[model samples]
Target: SGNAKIGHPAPSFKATAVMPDGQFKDISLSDYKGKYVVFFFYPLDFTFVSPTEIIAFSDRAEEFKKLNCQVIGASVDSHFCHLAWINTPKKQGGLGPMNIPLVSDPKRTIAQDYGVLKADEGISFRGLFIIDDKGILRQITINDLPVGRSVDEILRLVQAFQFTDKHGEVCPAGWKPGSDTIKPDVNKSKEYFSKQK
Candidate 1:
């Protein structure tokens, strides 16, 4: 995306959302301060490939909270459309009762700010952002229409960030929590560096 630059302050957005219980409410990106956010943009509701990613994140919502992160999704669809899709049966090809907050970017302003909007399709691509508690963009992953994203990878990456934040260390390749990290120091990092070769 043209503007999904990492390490910058995430673009702010406020919009209406359809909640877990099918209720509507106002939502803003800033309100999630003091916690990490997994704010993703799917193409549209009730479409293929969209539900898999949404429900995957929804099923693992508690896990994200365990790591002090909140989950949210946005698109150019109306809140009513989001509601109907979530209320639909999974067996019948609907996204059922996803507790993850689904916000409406009906005018595509937020999508434009996030650089996820494909004006030609009049919807967003598979754009995912990991914003830190301070409202800074930490990571960005955007996919094509047919490609779905991985919730586990998101969790893993968040864990890596948290570990680094708490320790001032750099996670090595294929690093996960409880794994070894290189101390963010030149002389002290020699031991880990020596092992790499």
Candidate 2:
């Protein structure tokens, strides 16, 4: 599989996932066409470090849904392991009641496709991919095992992408909805830049 490059088509995958309701189902990236997708990869399941990031996305799944986005989390663990972990209560260090699908990449092809698999460690890093509604890869962030990503930043990025897609203007640093965006032309760009100190 080819690497998932930004501004290009995201690598597609078809895998088994433990759905929010505790049933295992086959899911694919193509199933989410015409909607923004956030596909994130963690190192492992039933571990102390992964659940915090997983639950953070799960808690804000509804917020992503409101923006026409689908959140999917993946790891090398099997769907059965995912289900078992989900069945374990959050207080006991398991993911409880996931609002998003926890995908099982047992073969690790998806992680490899995304260029996040650590072959030596037999696991993936904190890889996150944000794909636009048209299936174009937009953003990619990878963090080490000990670091967890910010869900707020992910949501903000999605919103910024959506905003630019709708308005055709360029988003500035830390851009969000209702914030100033710059015109793309050479001379017309001053509308936003002139206002800055």
Candidate 3:
């Protein structure tokens, strides 16, 4: 499997998995075509930091939806495990609630295709990918197992990308949509640094 790069088409895969409602279904990247997709890969289910991220993302799902983005999470756990975890109460150390779909990659085929599989442990690390409506990967981030990622940051990055795609300008560091952008020209770049100092 090749490592997915930003601004390139995201590698697509399909797999049978149980939805949160315990129904078996086939999930594929094409299903999300013409819509922004936030695809994340966690290490495993019933782990220390994975649940936190899952819940946090669910909490902010509406925000992502507002931006015309669909959030999907994947792990090496079986779909049955995903259903079981979703069924368990949050107080009992499970994701009591969910707002998005959790696709199971028990064989890690999807994980391998995304180039996030840790062969030694048979699990994925914290791999996050943002794909646009055209199925192009606009951003990718991978972190070690110990560090949880920020949903807000992902949201902001998605917005920035959407803005750039619309405006044909480059976003500055710490840039937020509707803030300020540069034209990616030497003279135009001065407008950014000139105001800072």
Candidate 4:
């Protein structure tokens, strides 16, 4: 069972970490106030699956940005370690260069606040949270350490939420923006269902 759910206010925390540009800064959930935030947690740094996911997200960072959403990666690793990983060449088992910020949660406070911390291992799972402009968590997805997530799926989810927020209708499965949406009323649902086979 997960800790947080959709429609709940995301738990808050502040983390001091190194940005990809080699500057140290503090990041808190409040820093993302009034914007959509994609807060993701991985187990550790310099590992196999973790870097793949991080780099993939970095590659899609622009897409997320186009939608006014910021993608943040977090773990229990130190800021120094996060910097070293980002600086290390990809061939040398480092992340090479990434556009997104990797927040350090060595104390695990942020991880605990987000309900992704694994106390026994002192690490986090593959947890992703989509927070909207109002600071309410709109979606949450958690996976085990070995499982990798899809950047495309995250983008789609963001789009679905953005559409619903703007239009006040629920998106069906496999929904993309500009695709069909269903209102809750019976007549409206019938109008939508009528178009389908």
- Give stretches of model 1 more than 4 Å off: none
Instruction: Give the per-residue lDDT of model 2 (tens digit) for 15-41.
Output: 999998889999999999999999999
lDDT measured at residue 124 in model 4 versus the true structure, 0 to 100: 92
In terms of lDDT, model 2 sits at: 0.93
| Per-residue accuracy of model 1 over 64-95 as CA lDDT, tens digit each | 98989999988889998988888899987799
Tens digits of lDDT, candidate 4, 59-167 = 8899998999988999899988898889899887789878999999888877887788888878899999999888888988999999999999999999899988888
Model 2 scores worst on lDDT over the 10 consecutive residues at: 1-10
| Global local distance difference test of model 1 | 0.89
lDDT of each: 0.89, 0.93, 0.87, 0.87
Which portions of model 3 miss their true places by more than 4 Å? 20-22
Q: Which stretches of candidate 2 lie over 4 Å from their true place?
A: none
Order the candidate numbers by lDDT, best to worst.
Answer: 2, 1, 4, 3
Which order, best to worst by TM-score? 2, 1, 4, 3
Q: Kindly give the stretch of ten consecutive residues in candidate 3 with the minimal lDDT sum.
A: 15-24
RMSD of each: 1.1, 1.2, 1.6, 1.3
Note the clash tally of each candidate: 0, 0, 0, 0
lDDT of 3 by residue, 45-105 (tens): 8887899999999889999989999999999888888889888888777997678889988
Clashing residue pairs for model 1? none
Which candidate ranks first by lDDT, i.e. highest? 2
